[PDB]
């Protein structure tokens, strides 16, 4: 197929002046799924196609590949180049689709999607006039990290299990506090011993008549 | 390529040129500007070689005045070299019923083969001065844009041998896919 | 009202190791808090409240 | 209007093989407001415009409605069409904008956006070819489905209530520790009895004269 | 239409056609191709069929050698037909100015109406093949693509009636409507 | 900071049942947190070694 | 540049018809990077183009600035304005890139992108046929908000971290009840006191002779 | 502007025209309309006024038969003119090589200047007559389109004073930009 | 085992005082986890039973 991937995929050697096997990350290579201002996935889809295009030479077939502007034009976006090209028509920086930098982050191996590297009076841009991109550029790809990384266990638990959780333990407190303080279970008079079993009664006493009703006070206590 | 933070790493990556112009399955045609003056125009067997200057080596009474690509035939021998003139003007935007024709040499004759446009900005061919400028810049990334305004300019493209030097580059190759309408590449 | 779909679901993200530790962490959670709040006394004072002046003992 | 919805949109009888109403969920046909890579979605648009068009015509208007190349090219994706059509030139599968497929999560009702079944020398695609895509589909229609869930409630708290609520129950877990372990409040004289509230002072004394200044040894304790 | 997974299924859906063609505020033209040989094109009421072989019914010599549109009156007594036959031409890409013309008959000839084009792929008349190629492969889906690089090849157009069973599809007429500029449709 | 925008947004998100628990158990939270720390003993330690030596009582 | 900006941005005075120098946020501004549907962000990027312009012409250059057609169609959208002219055609809604509309959160200066005033008939749409998009586009301009808000925060701490906090709190409740209930220590004889250090053994004596192995009943206790 | 909900409000902006069209860097043709039927069209310095009835003021027996632009030079004696006619006939789309050509007057006739086309919708030139009403309800945003299908309709073109108090829109220039292709802006 | 990646980008994150407030109460909550269980007596009955019967002291 063309690049419409969903999910790493490298570039092979001969695509690349250093001549070496570089695999891009797959999350990042998959950014441009539907970015039309990102040069660097046009010259992705150009060489995707040419690919398919050994493919089907060296399969010997006898498809009918016709080769016109209008190829071209569906394969790269045409806006964005003619927007480059008027960039180039004042004096302002524009990239000739041929340079590409990112950010790399080495500990796990996750880079930024690699921008284009300006140029202007048939010259590179250097550091004293582009500072201030990869400083941000680098700050959000660690942002984006950590994002993914939280995204990656926040998409497969459910929020019904983490709130019965969280009330659970909130309740778990209540009642450990409520053992903690203790509360009070039965009165005992005042000056006197418990008098369970044959407890006294709301007005002092007791029904059978072994305990006077007189009265008497009585303090809430929780043991005997 | 350098650190860049505490445990970033700045790093650039560059893409080759020469596999991907010679792994197309068709034969591109290339545009190149070498030094700062020597335009060139690669198709399939025609390596053209264009330059600008006020010398008027074509005269309108003593010539083929070239209006349809049917009077082409009568100028070279080589449908290669037809096929190329006739692009490239298709390209740069020449529809031919509609703006001034253009001067070549009878076949027969013993000078080459050659073509040339006069595009000095005058009153007279003042608008095809200004189509061809705008046509010339699309098609050339950095264009010298010789012959300034003043008394004369024409520009003539002859038939030289192709310079291995030049930077093959393919914006200057995508432009001309672009601005050229129902191109045929052959291979 | 989303506590039945989970029910319905349980069968689906039970394969996760944080899942089942959280779930157990929850249940137990929950058994010793009443297990706890039974050995604090409030319905020991309902009982309290019941038996008072109807019975002697 | 036109297909711009910013939030079912459901497909009439007349529209559908099977002539059926059948309601896509909202959510998912709001997915293709920005996409121009989905031949499910130019369908759709060209469906809306067409009933657009009999609600003109039922209406008894004036209205000059011209149709000719350039409105067709405008309505449907021209890029899209043409790279169609060159995956179609090339041996390689395609879809003639007549059938699609989905996963459909048949509890909740939720489904992902009907992809294109790719075709093949005048055939379609069976699943031996094709196994690799509807798994990996179900499973983000999964995580797709647990994060809007989420997010729903994410998009409604304060960040700053549940964080308060957080200081809050650590403050008391705290606490109830600090009430748990108990501290010792007053100083007993080791041997004797709580001297509260004629208490004895730093060198172990009183300055009224009635407990003598020996530097008796105290012991830290919390009852009397 | 199957359950996969543990609690999803997986199930299909597929637009209707006629009422999508029968439903449009305009006529559309429809292309077909039937069996695996017979081409066909229906505007508003001509139903053309195409078919390519190397017979050739028409000459030079005594026919009309049709270069211009105005010229067309001249063929048909039906202004659909020619309608439809210069919109063809057009939308397959025949810029009549710069290209060979093509060969049709006298309308007081006793002879129906008929139209023929020669794409041979020889010398002469290559590009032109090309470009045809390339249309009728951008008109039609799976162009069977008759009368391969040899002696020679001719398309003819006649008017048959319409047969009810073409697969209305809808990609050709949309191709149709994208290379055809300025195509007005009636009703 | 955000908290005085908090307050000043408070009756907006007020209408909203787990707000109100929240709302509800942070301030139950705290209070019982206060009290429980004043029957800790903090304060009564403070008031002891302000009382220490001055007082014989 | 062009308006490609990765993060504010104003118009000045003399773009507005108040004539005042009135800032839009940055975040609102950033939104419309990659959208191709909004006419305020086609007007944005003309307005962009002059100003460049007006740089050009005050430096005083030579750039070849030339202006055509297939400028001005690279610079806005041809397909949006060629839908809103076939809006046009049909008596429906359209807008004709002049006026726009926003709701404003006038405490924390958070402002949603401006649409489009929609037209009809040479007039403008007023409240009656308009009041059902508002009050979405508030809800969603607070919803957007608070989500923001809170990925602000979540972008910057680490998952691990709030997990390790999480079960530290959880074992620190566990292990604080445990002390809180209370677990028996030792064995006494029931109806005596404790034998510590002098401690029966399993069957209810010592091995030593001073307590003799008569299988005393015990019962575990934590004190002495 | 006015208060929603309970902390937000409701407010709008408009964008201004007269500066963005006297900042341009160079000068843009600009359509308008004005009362219900006066259409007005300013290039350069050619400030056309366009009216339609069926009131036939020029003849093709005696006048000149304009199918090039190269004749428009026998037309009017200053150049804006000229490239203000030929512009907007381009933009409204008239590829002088397949279409009726247009009637003008010898330019040293002491009659001014002017020109007219018919669109007329019936048996011939019905084409013709659409194509005009498609191209002119993309050039103007509320065409009034008067002239309904009937006897006749010609269109006159007259040069007159630019009114100041046309609404300097915005919408059709950028469509006249769009359709005409290759048109060259001037300072 | 993102713990140890964690260990490794430590000098990273620490310049927020959300996160040097959470690393230290979880440093706390495990330290007096630890003490408070040292407190409850498991040990003390693993010791317990060490000793039972083997030593009458
Ligand atoms: C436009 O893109 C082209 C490539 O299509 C860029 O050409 C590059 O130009 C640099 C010089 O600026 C070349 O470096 C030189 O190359 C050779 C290596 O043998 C040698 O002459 C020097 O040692 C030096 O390294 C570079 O190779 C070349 N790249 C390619 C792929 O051909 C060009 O820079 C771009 N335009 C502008 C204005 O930057
Ligand atoms: C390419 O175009 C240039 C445009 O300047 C041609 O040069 C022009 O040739 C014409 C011939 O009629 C000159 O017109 C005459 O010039 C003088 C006054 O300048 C006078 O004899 C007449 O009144 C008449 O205007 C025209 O001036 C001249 N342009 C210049 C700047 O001198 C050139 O010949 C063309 N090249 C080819 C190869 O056809
Ligand atoms: C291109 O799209 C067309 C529709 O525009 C697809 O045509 C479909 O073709 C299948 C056969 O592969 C048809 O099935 C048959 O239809 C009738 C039903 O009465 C009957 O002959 C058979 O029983 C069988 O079911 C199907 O109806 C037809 N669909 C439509 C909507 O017309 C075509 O499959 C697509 N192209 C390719 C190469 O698949
Ligand atoms: C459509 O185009 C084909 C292209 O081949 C035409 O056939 C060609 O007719 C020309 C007539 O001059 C033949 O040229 C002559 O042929 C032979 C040698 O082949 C010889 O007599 C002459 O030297 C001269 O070259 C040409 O060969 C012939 N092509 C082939 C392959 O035989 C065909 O006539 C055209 N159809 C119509 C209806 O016009
Ligand atoms: C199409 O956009 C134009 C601007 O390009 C809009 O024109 C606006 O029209 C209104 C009337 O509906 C004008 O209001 C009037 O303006 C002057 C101010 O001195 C005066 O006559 C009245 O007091 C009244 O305020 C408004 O100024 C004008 N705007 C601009 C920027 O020129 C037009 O409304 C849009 N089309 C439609 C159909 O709404
Ligand atoms: C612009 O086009 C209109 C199209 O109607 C021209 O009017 C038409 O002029 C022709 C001249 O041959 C008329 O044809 C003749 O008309 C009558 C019957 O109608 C009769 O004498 C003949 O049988 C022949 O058909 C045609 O009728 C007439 N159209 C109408 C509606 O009357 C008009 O002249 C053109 N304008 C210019 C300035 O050229
Ligand atoms: C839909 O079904 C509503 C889901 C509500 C879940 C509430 C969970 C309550 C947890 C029980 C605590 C019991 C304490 C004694
Ligand atoms: C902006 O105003 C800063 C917001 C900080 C909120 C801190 C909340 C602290 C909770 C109080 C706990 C009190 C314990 C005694
Ligand atoms: C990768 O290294 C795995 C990371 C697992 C982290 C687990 C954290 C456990 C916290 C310790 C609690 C100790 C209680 C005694
Ligand atoms: C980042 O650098 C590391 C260093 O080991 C390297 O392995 C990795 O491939 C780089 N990432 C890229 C090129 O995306
Ligand atoms: C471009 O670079 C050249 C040297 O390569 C230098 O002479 C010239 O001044 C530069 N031009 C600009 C505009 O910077
Ligand atoms: C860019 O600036 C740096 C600053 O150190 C300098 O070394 C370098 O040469 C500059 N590059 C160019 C192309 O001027
Ligand atoms: C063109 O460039 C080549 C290669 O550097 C050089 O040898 C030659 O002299 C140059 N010619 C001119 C005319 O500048
Ligand atoms: C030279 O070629 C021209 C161009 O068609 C032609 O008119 C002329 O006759 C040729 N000359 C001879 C001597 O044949
Ligand atoms: C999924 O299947 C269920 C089965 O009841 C059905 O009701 C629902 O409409 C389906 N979802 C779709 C078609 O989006
Ligand atoms: C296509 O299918 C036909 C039968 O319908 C078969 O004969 C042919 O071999 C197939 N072609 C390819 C390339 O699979
Ligand atoms: C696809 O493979 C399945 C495997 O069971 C088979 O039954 C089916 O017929 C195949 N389809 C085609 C079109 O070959
Ligand atoms: C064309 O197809 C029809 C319908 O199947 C069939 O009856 C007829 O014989 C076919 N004709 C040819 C020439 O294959
Ligand atoms: C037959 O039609 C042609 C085509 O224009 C024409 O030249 C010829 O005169 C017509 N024949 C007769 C007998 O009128
Ligand atoms: C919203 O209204 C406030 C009121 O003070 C104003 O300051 C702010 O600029 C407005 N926001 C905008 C225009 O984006
Ligand atoms: C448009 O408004 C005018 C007044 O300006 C009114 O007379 C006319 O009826 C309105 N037309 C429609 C279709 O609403
Ligand atoms: C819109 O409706 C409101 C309702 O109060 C009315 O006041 C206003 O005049 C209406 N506007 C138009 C243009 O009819
Ligand atoms: C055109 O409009 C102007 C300005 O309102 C007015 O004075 C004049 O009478 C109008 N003319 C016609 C013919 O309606
Ligand atoms: C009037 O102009 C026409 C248009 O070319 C021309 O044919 C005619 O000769 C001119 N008249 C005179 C008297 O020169």
């Known amino acids: 197929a063309f690049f419409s991937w969903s999910l790493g995929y490298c570039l092979e050697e001969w695509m690349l002046v250093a001549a070496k096997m570089k695999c891009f990350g797959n999350t990042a290579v998959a950014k441009c799924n539907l970015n039309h201002d990102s040069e660097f996935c046009d010259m992705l889809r150009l060489f995707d196609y040419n690919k398919n295009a050994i493919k089907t030479l060296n399969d010997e077939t006898k498809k009918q590949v016709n080769l016109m502007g209008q190829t071209i034009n569906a394969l790269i976006s045409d806006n964005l180049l003619m927007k480059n090209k008027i960039r180039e028509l004042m004096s302002v920086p524009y990239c000739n689709y041929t340079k590409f930098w990112y950010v790399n982050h080495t500990l796990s191996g996750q880079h930024s999607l690699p921008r284009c590297w300006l140029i202007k009076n048939n010259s590179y841009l250097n550091i004293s006039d582009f500072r201030n991109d990869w400083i941000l550029e680098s700050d959000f790809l660690i942002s984006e990290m950590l994002s993914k990384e939280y995204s990656d266990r926040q998409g497969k638990t459910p929020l019904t299990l983490v709130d019965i959780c969280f009330w659970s333990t909130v309740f778990f407190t209540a009642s450990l506090f409520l053992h903690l303080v203790g509360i009070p279970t039965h009165r005992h008079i005042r000056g006197e011993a418990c008098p369970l079993p044959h407890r006294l009664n709301s007005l002092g006493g007791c029904r059978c008549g072994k305990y006077p009703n007189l009265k008497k006070p009585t303090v809430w206590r929780r043991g005997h | 390529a350098f650190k860049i933070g505490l445990h970033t790493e700045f790093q650039t990556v560059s893409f080759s040129m020469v596999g991907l112009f010679s792994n197309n399955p068709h034969d591109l045609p290339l545009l190149c500007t070498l030094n700062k003056s020597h335009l060139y125009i690669k198709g399939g067997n025609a390596s053209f070689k264009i330059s600008f200057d006020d010398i008027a080596v074509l005269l309108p009474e003593y010539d083929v005045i070239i209006q349809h690509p049917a009077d082409m035939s009568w100028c070279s021998k080589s449908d290669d070299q037809i096929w190329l003139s006739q692009w490239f003007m298709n390209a740069v935007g020449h529809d031919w019923y509609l703006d001034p024709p253009f001067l070549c040499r009878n076949r027969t004759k013993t000078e080459g083969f050659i073509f040339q446009v006069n595009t000095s900005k005058t009153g007279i061919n003042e608008n095809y001065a200004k189509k061809f400028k705008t046509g010339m810049h699309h098609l050339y990334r950095e264009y010298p844009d010789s012959c300034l305004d003043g008394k004369l300019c024409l520009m003539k493209a002859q038939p030289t041998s192709w310079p291995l030097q030049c930077p093959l580059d393919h914006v200057n190759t995508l432009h001309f896919l672009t601005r050229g309408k129902n191109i045929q590449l052959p291979r | ?57």
């Open chain 3, 1 to 57: 009202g989303q506590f039945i779909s989970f029910m319905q679901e349980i069968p689906t993200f039970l394969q996760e190791a944080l899942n089942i530790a959280l779930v157990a962490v929850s249940l137990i959670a929950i058994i010793k808090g009443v297990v706890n709040l039974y050995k604090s006394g409030l319905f020991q004072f309902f009982v309290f409240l019941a038996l008072a002046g109807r019975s002697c003992t």
